[PDB]
Design a protein around this ligand. Structure first.
Ligand SMILES: O=c1ccn([C@@H]2O[C@H](COP(=O)(O)O)[C@@H](O)[C@H]2O)c(=O)[nH]1
Ligand SMILES: O=c1ccn([C@@H]2O[C@H](COP(=O)(O)O)[C@@H](O)[C@H]2O)c(=O)[nH]1
Ligand SMILES: O=c1ccn([C@@H]2O[C@H](COP(=O)(O)O)[C@@H](O)[C@H]2O)c(=O)[nH]1
Lengths: 312, 312, 312
């Protein structure tokens, strides 16, 4: 029954193997509280400021539900740039120093990488990064790792297929970052060659002793795997190489014909939203875990709000 | 003290004479709870997800106030299409399966007819239709019928003038649908000939034994009526027929000179917002019931939230 | 323990010397409630409708936090013009008469001057003006005067520099209005000649016996002053007179070199947001009171919500 060791929750590089495992146990407690028929009061009298610079329905409501299930209450904007309707302009650090006067914890989604760290360094109240523009999405990585542990029973000695746009994929890079803190983890990188995982992750996995292999055969890798983690491939990542897009039509898709060839105890994960890269008919299969994934988000974020505001 | 018989509240064709009368009694209880000076706890620990695809201030706040007066709490978006700011696209069924993880009941206003039914069929939690685009607006019909019963004392043996754009009028069609489940109901259809009520409603009233009559004399019908239910007539419904618009200038208007000729116990109803089709000076008359109409909305929706979440 | 004497909070000309001093004492109580570790229940079961016609993050959250810290709850729109997504148009008085059915107090920010008074005159529930377009911003004036009293210990016998666009400056005019209700107040008007304070304020101060002096030397006035109240000067207020803009570059700026020359017990005030007219390095100085200003906003508005809803 002590202080949470992190002052703020900003970057994947803040969490070790022990910290993670300890947070996952808290999230299992959080799930018990959510399941209960009496309203929790753990965060009674605490207010959360949801500072979003852009609408992001799913993750905003995830955090706001999380606060409410613990007894706390929310302030919300998805128009953080509009600080006053009558006097134009907005400074991140000015917004933080104004809003911390109104609230006990800020959950921020800025448009610009590096914003979450500046907020943390400016605020006298805890800050959680909900999406630092195209940079760190820490709570999404933690809820990916939690779902795996949740659905598989272990993180040590697992095989995980990361599929789709790996070059530009923010959640596959930080999932891959976090898994490498466990033992006997094998990672498959399943993508067309031109959206293939970047070297900074390849050479960090190799420094971590994580085994890693590349493929463009999804069928082949799906059969050997605990976890198929799926992301779309936007057409625009192909540029003028339509021949390569036409080569890639059909092959990086989770559909019935890929469920056919998978272990019965494997899962399909997908941070959502999805385009056509998982057909609707995969939903009926108890191995489609992407909606249970989203639900783990509520627990993980209950956990984080709880550690940051009242401690272990 | 049993389960509410409807799993979801989607379409007018779900409610019979008995169900309605039973819901109206609950809404009279709900009004007592709202009038009380202690905060109700009936829905303590329940969360409502207000999933609106477009801003709709009045009906959104109506439902959100309703939840709060019963002790419950709200999640709210009027930007449901924007599921993530970083990964584009949104699937109705995916949105429902994500958000039901965060909430206990969804109140949805989609842009497309048929959306409310799909949500109900996808969700493992009750769903209320707040506006299925240009289709069913069930809670608005129920609050129209409730106001009539509320202000008139009876639904059996009443005369109700439905006035304005009847061809394209969603609330006049479903008001008319619902009234036909009562006895000795006479309906007047008061409109220019080119926005005159469509045949599917005319031939269902005639199958229900509801007496119905058409007119373009508002003055004439107002004098024989319990209820004048008023809707605007957008100029654009006239197309190139401006001669017909100029013919219609002044005659489909509730003003002092129409109050002059009405029973003292008749009421002016109007789902709002209004353009110029009810002059401001009608507001002072105790027969203008359109604001008491809006207030009945709060009760009816308290009722629905209450039946759906904790039963009769 | 009596009724609050104001039915609504709309205009600076509603508050005398006694009323202000009494409100400031309440706001000091409100600060004690906010500092407490148990959740206040003073406004339990009261709902506030935040009716904003335009996003205005800082003042909206200020009021909403205020309601929550007292135990009350909020309804919120920053899209008040959009009354229904399906039937276009909105009438201020219709919006008020609909929304008062859902709520116990309305906090309104309209786009048009005179809107707050009409709302007050239409509503059967208290109304607070959060910003009547380019007209009265009463709670901002009250939180300016409160900060001065809060940070200086007195309002009688003080010197206050009002700096920036005084011609067009809404908060400097109403700050200046309110200060003139105290004794031995000297006001400096520090600006370029073409955005110099207007005659209606100059001749009311002179009718109040308030001493007032104009300058374009900030350095000179800063040294003699309790309070430097700073506002930006938009380039566009110069029109084609760029020569005058180039003359004004650098001289109406609060930076270290102006802190150097000020009393140790003087304060920098600025309603925010700020452009470049206060360098970031002024923030470290304990005399920069603009963030403590914003925090006083929470107290003052707690006070107002409390007087209006449950009395002294
Ligand atoms: O096909 C997809 C869908 C989502 N995402 C990632 O998942 C995140 C989901 O978190 P949020 O945007 O909903 O907060 C997005 O930010 C984005 O990085 C992908 O990489 N690919
Ligand atoms: O002059 C009017 C005003 C409103 N409505 C109807 O009333 C509904 C009010 O419900 P809401 O849009 O406020 O939810 C609208 O959707 C629309 O069908 C009309 O038919 N005519
Ligand atoms: O440089 C500035 C910043 C703000 N304001 C005033 O301060 C108010 C702050 O209140 P709000 O717009 O945040 O409610 C604005 O409305 C505006 O009148 C200025 O005059 N100058």
């Amino acid at each position: 029954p002590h202080m949470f060791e992190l002052s703020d929750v900003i970057e994947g590089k803040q969490f070790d193997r022990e910290m993670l495992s300890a947070i996952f146990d808290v999230a299992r407690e959080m799930e018990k509280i959510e399941k209960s028929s009496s309203q929790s009061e753990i965060l009674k009298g605490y207010l959360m400021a949801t500072l979003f610079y852009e609408p992001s329905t799913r993750t905003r409501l995830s955090f706001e539900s999380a606060m409410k299930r613990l007894g706390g209450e929310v302030l919300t904007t998805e128009n953080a740039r509009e600080a006053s309707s009558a006097a134009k302009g907005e400074t991140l650090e000015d917004t933080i120093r104004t809003v911390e006067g109104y609230s006990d914890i800020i959950v921020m989604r800025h448009f610009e990488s590096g914003a979450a760290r500046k907020a943390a360094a400016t605020a006298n109240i805890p800050v959680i990064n909900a999406g630092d523009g195209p940079g760190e999405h820490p709570t999404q990585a933690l809820l990916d790792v939690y779902t795996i542990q949740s659905e598989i029973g272990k993180l040590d000695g697992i095989s995980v297929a990361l599929v789709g746009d790996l070059a530009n994929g923010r959640t596959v890079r930080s999932l891959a970052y976090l898994l490498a803190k466990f033992k006997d983890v094998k990672i498959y990188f399943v993508s067309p060659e031109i959206v293939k995982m970047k070297d900074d992750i390849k050479d960090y996995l190799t420094s971590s002793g994580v085994e890693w292999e590349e493929s463009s055969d999804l069928m082949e890798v799906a059969s050997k795997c605990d976890v198929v983690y799926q992301t779309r491939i936007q057409r625009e990542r192909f540029g003028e190489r339509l021949d390569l897009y036409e080569a890639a039509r059909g092959k990086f898709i989770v559909d019935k014909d890929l469920l056919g060839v998978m272990q019965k105890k494997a899962i399909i994960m997908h941070p959502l939203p999805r385009l056509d890269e998982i057909t609707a008919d995969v939903d009926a299969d108890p191995r489609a875990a992407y909606f249970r994934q989203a639900k783990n988000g509520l627990f993980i974020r209950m956990a984080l709000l709880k550690l940051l505001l009242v401690g272990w």
